[PDB]
Amino acid sequence: NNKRAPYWTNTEKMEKRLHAVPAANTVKFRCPAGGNPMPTMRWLKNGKEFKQEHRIGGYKVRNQHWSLIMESVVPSDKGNYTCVVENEYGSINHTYHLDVV
Known part of the structure; x- marks a missing residue:
């Protein structure tokens, strides 16, 4: 049980590309990926990165992977x-198109 893609x-x-982002509300980030108990994921928004250690208003993640909610x-x-x-076996990238409402 180690780190495996x-x-x-x-x-x-x-369920992530074309979405509706309510202004002044928390953003729902979905990235379901079944694998080992050690999944590493980076968060990039419009060329901006945000560490789970610091988020605008707070940071919450379900268990560790699958779903991640940021404010x-x-x-x-x-x-x-x-x-x-x-x-530990590689890095993948996914792009999504959200619209400001």
Whole structure:
């Protein structure tokens, strides 16, 4: 049980690309990837990176992987979300198109 690349379970193309981001609200980030118990993922929004250790208003993640919720009241202006999940066997990148409402 170490770090092993997680295979995407749910298509992000059908639940992450075209989405609706409510201004002054928390952003729902989905990146389901079944794999080992050590999944590493980077968060990039419109060319901006945000560490889980620090988030606008707070940071919450389910267990460790699958779903991740971040609070974006100001950054919401940027409706570009790209999920890059890295592992000990490689790094993957995913782009999503959110719209500011």
